[PDB]
Amino acid sequence: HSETFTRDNNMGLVKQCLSSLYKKNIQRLTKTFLTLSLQDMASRVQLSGPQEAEKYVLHMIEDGEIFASINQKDGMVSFHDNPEKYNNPAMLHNIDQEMLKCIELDERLKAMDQEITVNPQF
Amino acid sequence: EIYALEIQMYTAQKNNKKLKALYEQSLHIKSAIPHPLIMGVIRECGGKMHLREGEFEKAHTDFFEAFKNYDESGSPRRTTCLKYLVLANMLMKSGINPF
Amino acid sequence: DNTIHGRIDQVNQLLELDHQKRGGARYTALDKWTNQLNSLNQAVVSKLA
Amino acid sequence: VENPSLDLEQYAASYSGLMRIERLQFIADHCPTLRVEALKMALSFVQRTFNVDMYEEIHRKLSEATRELQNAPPALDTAWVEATRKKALLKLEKLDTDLKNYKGNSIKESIRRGHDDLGDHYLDCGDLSNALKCYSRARDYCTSAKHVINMCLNVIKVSVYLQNWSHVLSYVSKAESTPEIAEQRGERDSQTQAILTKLKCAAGLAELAARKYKQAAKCLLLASFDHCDFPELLSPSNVAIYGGLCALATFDRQELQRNVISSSSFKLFLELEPQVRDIIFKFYESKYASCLKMLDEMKDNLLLDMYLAPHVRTLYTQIRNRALIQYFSPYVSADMHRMAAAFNTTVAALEDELTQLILEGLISARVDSHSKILYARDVDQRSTTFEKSLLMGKEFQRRAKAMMLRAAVLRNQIHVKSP
């Protein structure tokens, strides 16, 4: 259906899904393996060759889609699998900010509730 | 007293499939009867098919009553019947209070 | 059968034992409150349109 | 599909009625080499019990059987096919008038006696749909609870050969709670009439086909050794094979020891089957290297069985799964190489085996494929409640945006009309 897709001038975005599936495939591995080989990954992800494996590892990391790292010496991928422990101002600030946006939301609703006050009866 | 001699033959033979059926049937006949030593000959062999079976709570009490029948009359099994009353209480995993 | 509270590290030939006990209540209790709000706010959205 | 170690002599011995013909024909079907034998044994008993519907079926296979056996390098006895046929056809009309002259008498028990004869000789001739109805009308000519049961038992018998198991269970559910919940106590301490031992033989076997292997085990584990040989449904040598492997798969370790291994009720049936007993034991004893070794080599015979063929995967695989969980859970860190030979397979195989089970199943554990180890993976409680609270709140914020705009669009009567 290259036609049907290219007819709508959204081909490329359909091919961005082709790449996000490769990235989904690797995203799953975190849940199963915690230490895996580049070659093993290359064979399981279907990209073929340890480079193509090592490639998306870097990119996903560089971007920040997955928590992992590489030991090239052996040629292995180690999955950190660990972000943040909610033990610092880092969250505290986000906690302050994300909360203020819910209060911002309450402020609107409170004004929107008072909007209904003045209009006709029942 | 007929079921006494049936349980006595199969205790020498090692037929647990019939002995189990025999003891269960010699507890309904244990009611309508006077009182001999024989009423402990079946209880000791009946407790043996609750040690074998695993349920030691139904052997434990069986070997107390059989021990008491050898206590009144002859005691050839009384010296080895207490071995099964004590062995029950330990393997009962709770008893630990025999003597 | 769950008498000994523990688990085995076969590679290291040892036995780490269950013990690591902390305030598991706060987090599990709040978990529920978090869930009820999730289903609640959508019920208020499905009221209006 | 084949197994050489198979005794047809025993397979026919413990069974009778249609069950002999149904089982013998399923063996001849999926098991060749012993198709030479299996079709001869169906033929002989079909020539008894005044049966042409089955002879025209069975003997036609004998021809095509011997036809394919001449491709490696009996005759249609039409003198007999006429003999049994007119004999049977007129015996119907005798029993017809017998019932019609029992209906003229107006006796309650004499008409039910007629009915039960009609259904029998229509079963005899292989006719099921007719045989079915004879017992159905016998419900009207009754008085006692035992008469409404002694027919309801037959009602099921036929609905098994028909393979409408839904109505097998509909009339077991009726027959069970018929005489005020099985006469209350069970006829005062041990009953000569072993009745519910039959009613649970069917209630289970009906569920066996219906995939509820756990519900099936509940009905097959209660099967006491009073009824033993009931040839028109299922033998006791199978009740052990069936209900044992059923529970095994869908039962946890706890209910096993209690409702399977140390329960006398079913214990007698386990004695009968020494191989089935060993796999249930070696599972609980957690000696898995053997447990599956046994089961694998039994698979050959259990497939050729009529009623244990269609659950040979969901059971066998679900047991493997169960054991794979039970082996690991106790360990915090387990060596895969040890676990490999323990589950009759390879390291690489085990790797993928677990992988699936991690994603789907309850194997909360990751894989270290570098040194080939399996570590237990437990949850950071704290992280969890935090993590989701942010995310949920962010979802709530997203919908709040939406229903604020949605309050606006309806407030302004915004929509694209058609005409």
Curated annotation (Swiss-Prot), chain A:
Tissues where the protein occurs: Widely expressed. Expressed at high level in heart and skeletal muscle.
Location in the cell: Cytoplasm; Nucleus
Similarity comment: Belongs to the CSN3 family.
Other remarks on this protein: Amplified and overexpressed in some osteosarcomas (OS), suggesting that it may participate in TP53 degradation in OS.
Subunit structure: Component of the CSN complex, composed of COPS1/GPS1, COPS2, COPS3, COPS4, COPS5, COPS6, COPS7 (COPS7A or COPS7B), COPS8 and COPS9 isoform 1. In the complex, it probably interacts directly with COPS1, COPS4, COPS8 and COPS9 isoform 1. Interacts with CK2 and PKD. Interacts with the translation initiation factor EIF3S6 and IKBKG. Interacts with ERCC6.
Known role: Component of the COP9 signalosome complex (CSN), a complex involved in various cellular and developmental processes. The CSN complex is an essential regulator of the ubiquitin (Ubl) conjugation pathway by mediating the deneddylation of the cullin subunits of SCF-type E3 ligase complexes, leading to decrease the Ubl ligase activity of SCF-type complexes such as SCF, CSA or DDB2. The complex is also involved in phosphorylation of p53/TP53, c-jun/JUN, IkappaBalpha/NFKBIA, ITPK1 and IRF8/ICSBP, possibly via its association with CK2 and PKD kinases.
Protein name: COP9 signalosome complex subunit 3
Annotated source species: Homo sapiens (Human)
UniProtKB/Swiss-Prot annotation, chain B:
Free-text description of this protein's post-translational modifications in UniProt: Phosphorylated by CK2 and PKD kinases.
Subcellular location: Cytoplasm; Nucleus
Superkingdom of the source species: Eukaryota
Similarity comment: Belongs to the CSN2 family.
Assembly and binders: Component of the CSN complex, composed of COPS1/GPS1, COPS2, COPS3, COPS4, COPS5, COPS6, COPS7 (COPS7A or COPS7B), COPS8 and COPS9 isoform 1. In the complex, it probably interacts directly with COPS1, COPS4, COPS5, COPS6 and COPS7 (COPS7A or COPS7B). Specifically interacts with the ligand binding domain of the thyroid receptor (TR). Does not require the presence of thyroid hormone for its interaction. Interacts with CUL1 and CUL2. Interacts with IRF8/ICSBP1 and with nuclear receptors NR2F1 and NR0B1. Interacts with NIF3L1.
Record's function text: Essential component of the COP9 signalosome complex (CSN), a complex involved in various cellular and developmental processes. The CSN complex is an essential regulator of the ubiquitin (Ubl) conjugation pathway by mediating the deneddylation of the cullin subunits of SCF-type E3 ligase complexes, leading to decrease the Ubl ligase activity of SCF-type complexes such as SCF, CSA or DDB2. The complex is also involved in phosphorylation of p53/TP53, c-jun/JUN, IkappaBalpha/NFKBIA, ITPK1 and IRF8/ICSBP, possibly via its association with CK2 and PKD kinases.
Protein name: COP9 signalosome complex subunit 2
Gene label: COPS2
Portion of the full-length sequence here: 196 to 294 of 443
Swiss-Prot record, chain D:
UniProt tissue specificity: Widely expressed.
Residues in PCI domain copies: 219-381
Family: Belongs to the CSN1 family.
Residue positions, PTM Phosphoserine: S418
Pfam families: CSN1_C, PCI, RPN7
Keyword S-adenosyl-L-methionine recorded: no
Recorded domain comment: The PCI domain is necessary and sufficient for the interactions with other CSN subunits of the complex. Mediates the interaction with CAPN8.
BP GO annotations: JNK cascade; protein deneddylation; protein neddylation; regulation of protein neddylation
InterPro entries recorded: CSN1_C (IPR048624), PCI_dom (IPR000717), Rpn7/CSN1 (IPR019585), Rpn7_N (IPR045135), WH_DNA-bd_sf (IPR036390)
Subcellular location: Cytoplasm; Nucleus
Function, in words: Essential component of the COP9 signalosome complex (CSN), a complex involved in various cellular and developmental processes. The CSN complex is an essential regulator of the ubiquitin (Ubl) conjugation pathway by mediating the deneddylation of the cullin subunits of SCF-type E3 ligase complexes, leading to decrease the Ubl ligase activity of SCF-type complexes such as SCF, CSA or DDB2. The complex is also involved in phosphorylation of p53/TP53, c-jun/JUN, IkappaBalpha/NFKBIA, ITPK1 and IRF8/ICSBP, possibly via its association with CK2 and PKD kinases.
Organism domain of life: Eukaryota
PROSITE patterns named among the record's database cross-references: PCI
Keywords: Cytoplasm, Nucleus, Phosphoprotein, Signalosome
Name of the protein in its database record: COP9 signalosome complex subunit 1
Oligomer status and interactors: Component of the CSN complex, composed of COPS1/GPS1, COPS2, COPS3, COPS4, COPS5, COPS6, COPS7 (COPS7A or COPS7B), COPS8 and COPS9 isoform 1. In the complex, it probably interacts directly with COPS2, COPS3, COPS4 and COPS5. Interacts directly with inositol kinase ITPK1. Interacts with CAPN8. Interacts with USP48. Interacts with ASB4; this interaction negatively regulates GPS1.
MF (Gene Ontology): GTPase inhibitor activity
Chief subcellular location: cytoplasm
Organism this protein belongs to: Homo sapiens (Human)
GO cellular component: COP9 signalosome; cytoplasm; cytosol; nucleoplasm; nucleus
